Structures are given as C-alpha cells and as structure tokens.
Scaffold this active site. Structure first.
Site, PDB file in Angstrom:
ATOM      1  N   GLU A  63      67.288  12.814 -32.076  1.00 13.98           N
ATOM      2  CA  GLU A  63      67.945  12.380 -33.301  1.00 13.98           C
ATOM      3  C   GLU A  63      66.902  11.693 -34.163  1.00 13.98           C
ATOM      4  O   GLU A  63      66.156  10.840 -33.675  1.00 13.98           O
ATOM      5  CB  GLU A  63      69.070  11.390 -32.993  1.00 13.98           C
ATOM      6  CG  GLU A  63      69.722  10.749 -34.200  1.00 13.98           C
ATOM      7  CD  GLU A  63      70.757   9.744 -33.773  1.00 13.98           C
ATOM      8  OE1 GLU A  63      70.382   8.694 -33.192  1.00 13.98           O
ATOM      9  OE2 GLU A  63      71.944  10.010 -34.035  1.00 13.98           O
ATOM     10  N   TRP A 147      67.674   2.702 -24.495  1.00 14.66           N
ATOM     11  CA  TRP A 147      69.121   2.525 -24.455  1.00 14.66           C
ATOM     12  C   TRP A 147      69.637   2.917 -23.079  1.00 14.66           C
ATOM     13  O   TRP A 147      69.235   3.946 -22.524  1.00 14.66           O
ATOM     14  CB  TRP A 147      69.824   3.404 -25.493  1.00 14.66           C
ATOM     15  CG  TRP A 147      69.547   3.050 -26.923  1.00 14.66           C
ATOM     16  CD1 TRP A 147      70.311   2.252 -27.721  1.00 14.66           C
ATOM     17  CD2 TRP A 147      68.464   3.521 -27.742  1.00 14.66           C
ATOM     18  NE1 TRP A 147      69.756   2.167 -28.982  1.00 14.66           N
ATOM     19  CE2 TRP A 147      68.622   2.936 -29.017  1.00 14.66           C
ATOM     20  CE3 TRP A 147      67.369   4.361 -27.519  1.00 14.66           C
ATOM     21  CZ2 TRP A 147      67.741   3.182 -30.069  1.00 14.66           C
ATOM     22  CZ3 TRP A 147      66.495   4.609 -28.577  1.00 14.66           C
ATOM     23  CH2 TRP A 147      66.687   4.016 -29.831  1.00 14.66           C
ATOM     24  N   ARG A 210      82.369   0.579 -29.077  1.00 15.83           N
ATOM     25  CA  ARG A 210      83.218   1.576 -29.716  1.00 15.83           C
ATOM     26  C   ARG A 210      84.555   0.941 -30.072  1.00 15.83           C
ATOM     27  O   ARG A 210      85.086   0.127 -29.307  1.00 15.83           O
ATOM     28  CB  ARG A 210      83.458   2.748 -28.768  1.00 15.83           C
ATOM     29  CG  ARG A 210      82.300   3.720 -28.742  1.00 15.83           C
ATOM     30  CD  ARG A 210      82.401   4.611 -27.533  1.00 15.83           C
ATOM     31  NE  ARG A 210      81.733   5.878 -27.785  1.00 15.83           N
ATOM     32  CZ  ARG A 210      81.853   6.933 -26.993  1.00 15.83           C
ATOM     33  NH1 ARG A 210      82.584   6.842 -25.893  1.00 15.83           N
ATOM     34  NH2 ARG A 210      81.253   8.075 -27.303  1.00 15.83           N
ATOM     35  N   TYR A 340      71.143   8.805 -39.639  1.00 19.05           N
ATOM     36  CA  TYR A 340      70.821   9.424 -38.356  1.00 19.05           C
ATOM     37  C   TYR A 340      71.183  10.897 -38.450  1.00 19.05           C
ATOM     38  O   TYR A 340      72.339  11.231 -38.739  1.00 19.05           O
ATOM     39  CB  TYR A 340      71.639   8.748 -37.253  1.00 19.05           C
ATOM     40  CG  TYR A 340      71.280   7.291 -37.072  1.00 19.05           C
ATOM     41  CD1 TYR A 340      70.444   6.891 -36.033  1.00 19.05           C
ATOM     42  CD2 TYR A 340      71.759   6.310 -37.948  1.00 19.05           C
ATOM     43  CE1 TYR A 340      70.085   5.563 -35.864  1.00 19.05           C
ATOM     44  CE2 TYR A 340      71.400   4.981 -37.787  1.00 19.05           C
ATOM     45  CZ  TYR A 340      70.571   4.624 -36.740  1.00 19.05           C
ATOM     46  OH  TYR A 340      70.206   3.300 -36.587  1.00 19.05           O
TER      47      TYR A 340
END
Ligand code: TRP
Ligand code: DST
Ligand code: CL
Ligand code: ZN
Ligand code: ZN
Length: 362
Positions: A63, A147, A210, A340
């Site tokens: 990405e 991450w 989220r 992104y």
C-alpha cells in the site's frame, strides 16, 4: 491478466516514479532500495504466487501512502512479509524483517523484541500477523514501522492480548486511554498495534480501533476529547469522504491513539482513517470527494492528482479499490491528511474487510 513481472519489481518501479513525482531526490532513491531490501524475500513471486495480503483489501501486499498535509512531501509504503504458498499467518518472514532493518538501517528493535514472542507466535489465530513499512521526506532519514494484529489470540481476545503487550513494554498505566476510546462496547474494538522502529524520544506506540455499525456522530464522539478533533469538522470530513452517508454500515471506521502522546497535551494523540472502497461506486467518485475536502488548498490537490496518476492503472470509473483510506488530523496550514492507495494487482471493487479477511471469516 497474464502476469509478467515480479511483485517486487512492479511495486519498486511505481514507488520510484512516485518518489520522483514528489521530488524526493536521493532520499527517495535510498527509500526505493529499502523497499527492495524488505521485499527481496518474496523472491520471483508474481501476484498470483503470494498469499492474499491484508495490506490492500484486494489482496495486494503493498500500500502506498502520500502525506497531503502542509509540510514537505512524504512517501510511505506498507508491505506484508510473505512467502509463496506459505500461509500469511506464518511468522518466519516477519521475524526476519526486524534483524534486516536493525543491521542494514539501524532501526531499533527494543520494543519489537519485547512483543515478538507474543504477537508473532507459531500459532496465530487470524489470517495475518504483520505488516512493515517505511516513510521518507526529502533530505531526512527513512523511518521504519511495524504493525501487529490483535486477533492473534482469537477475535474476542484483543483486549487481553493488547494488555499483555502493554505489560511487556511497561506501559499498562496507559490502559485507561485504551478503555476510554471504547464508547460502544462490543462495536468499538482494538485490532492493530504499531511501533515506530526507532529509539528517538518521539517514537510512538499506536493502538488502532475499528468502529463497526457507527454513525458519524459516534465517530466524532470518540475523537472529540483528543486535542483539535472539533466534532463539526470531524463529522463534515466523514460525510464528505462517505458521499453524504451518516453510517459506517459495512466497513468500519478506523481511529488510533498514540499511547505515549495521550498524557502529554503536545502532539495530538489521535488520528481518523476513513475507508474508501465500500461507500462509493468507483474511484472517480472517491476522487471527487478528495478534491472537495482539499478544495481550499490547491497545492495538496495537485500533489494528490499527480501521485494518483502514477499509481492508478485503469479508468477510475471502473470500480473501487485504488483508494484504500484517507486519514485526518488537525494541522497548521490545513488538516494533515494522508491518502492510502493500492497497486491493485487483483480484482477491482474489493469486498468489505478485504478478500483475505472475508475468506477467513467464511
Ligand atoms: N487493509 C487493512 C490494514 C490496513 C492497511 N492500511 C491501513 C490504513 C488504515 C487502517 C487499516 C489499514 C485494514 O483495512 O484493516
Ligand atoms: C495500518 C497501516 C499500514 C497504515 C496506517 S498507520 P500510518 O503510519 O500510515 O499513519 P501516521 O503517519 O502515523 O498517521
Ligand atoms: Cl506472452
Ligand atoms: Zn502470454
Ligand atoms: Zn507463479
């Protein structure tokens, strides 16, 4: 599509073109070399050879991200350590990246090493265990990032696992920061943890959340208490980027908190990330939304259009999937926004969550 080129070479070429568009000079050249170093382990893999990735929702393992804020241009990639035919949750590739970055670039492994046994185990539940990335500005050192996934111990174990990570880093006293970020129990959930791989005093530990089934007002309510997240501006930005929709009805909104900034009233600790591939008919419509939010700042709009032109490789109106996310933070001369973008090596119009996550959930 007949694939003629390794993933590494295709993405390195795009990254080099994007770095040139952003005038990154020698720092850009070193940045592309770092990308190649981090992806050498993919070997000769074409897109069909690697496991589907969680990096971009279509399954592409890269990405690109471009900072549209007022500071000088910055370019980032994220990637997934992977080997052809090996499940993405296997930890060996992720374990190999850290010593590569430490030895070749001097990236710091201190916090990474405290977490690796817990977050990169041999028996992770979820379909993915790691992403790594790098970001650079012209004339500045490359900054590396890792991450980790908080579903390693199952979908309902994220709080317990995150707490264990804080234990290992000696930062459990920041647990109330995590807790207060949850405004709707069961629907606001932590899912990722990142480290700046650096010994600098500004090196961050970030927790990403989220917000499922959330309305824009609820996302604004989460962010309001962090300095600068004025609800009217946050709600307006969400509505712009979701085409007037008021509800994150499938793909969750994402926010994060930089834990070591939450108690310092200095750099704002929070960021908003709006997902872009499920609330629009196509990337042409998404581009209209980006332009609308950037309309007051033509420099940012031109940077965005220029980077997009070098990354998109089909008509924007064919579907979604080129735009993954746009982020928002308050900024000096304008909000700090980062866009992104996916290399779109697989199918146009990815599903909610992503192809890999959907396959995992069945
Ligand atoms: N694609 C994954 C992970 C990811 C990559 N880049 C991101 C930027 C923001 C939030 C998540 C991500 C997701 O949507 O969860
Ligand atoms: C989850 C991924 C790959 C990217 C989102 S975090 P980031 O490092 O791009 O965001 P910031 O620059 O810290 O705002
Ligand atoms: Cl041929
Ligand atoms: Zn052929
Ligand atoms: Zn092959």
């Amino acid at each position: 599509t007949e694939e003629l080129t390794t993933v590494r070479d295709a993405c390195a070429r795009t990254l080099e073109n994007t770095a040139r568009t952003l005038h990154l000079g020698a720092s850009g050249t070193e940045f592309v070399a770092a990308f190649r170093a981090m992806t050498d382990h993919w070997g000769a893999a074409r897109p069909h050879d690697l496991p589907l990735s969680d990096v971009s929702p279509d399954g592409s393992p890269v990405e690109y991200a471009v900072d549209l804020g007022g500071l000088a241009p910055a370019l980032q990639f994220a990637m997934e350590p992977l080997t052809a035919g090996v499940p993405a949750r296997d930890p060996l590739a992720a374990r190999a990246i850290m010593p590569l970055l430490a030895g070749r670039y001097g990236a710091d492994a201190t916090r990474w090493s405290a977490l690796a046994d817990r977050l990169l185990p041999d028996d992770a539940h979820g379909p993915h265990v790691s992403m790594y990335g790098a970001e650079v500005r012209a004339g500045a050192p490359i900054r590396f990032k890792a991450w980790f996934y908080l579903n390693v111990t199952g979908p309902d174990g994220a709080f317990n696992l995150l707490y264990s990570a804080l234990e290992r880093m000696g930062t459990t006293h920041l647990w109330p920061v995590v807790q207060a970020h949850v405004h709707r129990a069961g629907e606001d959930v932590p899912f990722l943890l990142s480290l700046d791989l650096s010994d600098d005093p500004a090196a961050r530990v970030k927790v990403y959340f989220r917000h499922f089934a959330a309305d824009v007002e609820e996302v604004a309510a989460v962010l309001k208490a962090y300095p600068g997240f004025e609800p009217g501006e946050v709600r307006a930005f969400c509505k712009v980027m979701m085409g007037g929709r008021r509800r994150f009805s499938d793909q969750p909104a994402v926010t994060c908190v930089s834990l070591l900034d939450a108690q310092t009233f200095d750099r704002t600790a929070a960021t908003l990330y709006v997902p872009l591939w499920t609330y629009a008919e196509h990337d042409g419509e998404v581009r209209q939304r980006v332009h609308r939010t950037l309309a007051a700042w033509p420099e940012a709009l031109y940077r965005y259009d220029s980077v997009l032109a070098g990354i998109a490789h089909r008509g924007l109106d064919a579907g979604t999937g080129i735009h993954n996310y746009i982020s928002w933070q308050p900024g000096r001369t304008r909000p700090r926004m980062k866009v992104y973008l996916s290399p779109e090596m697989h199918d146009v119009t990815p599903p909610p969550l992503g192809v890999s996550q959907q396959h995992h959930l069945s």
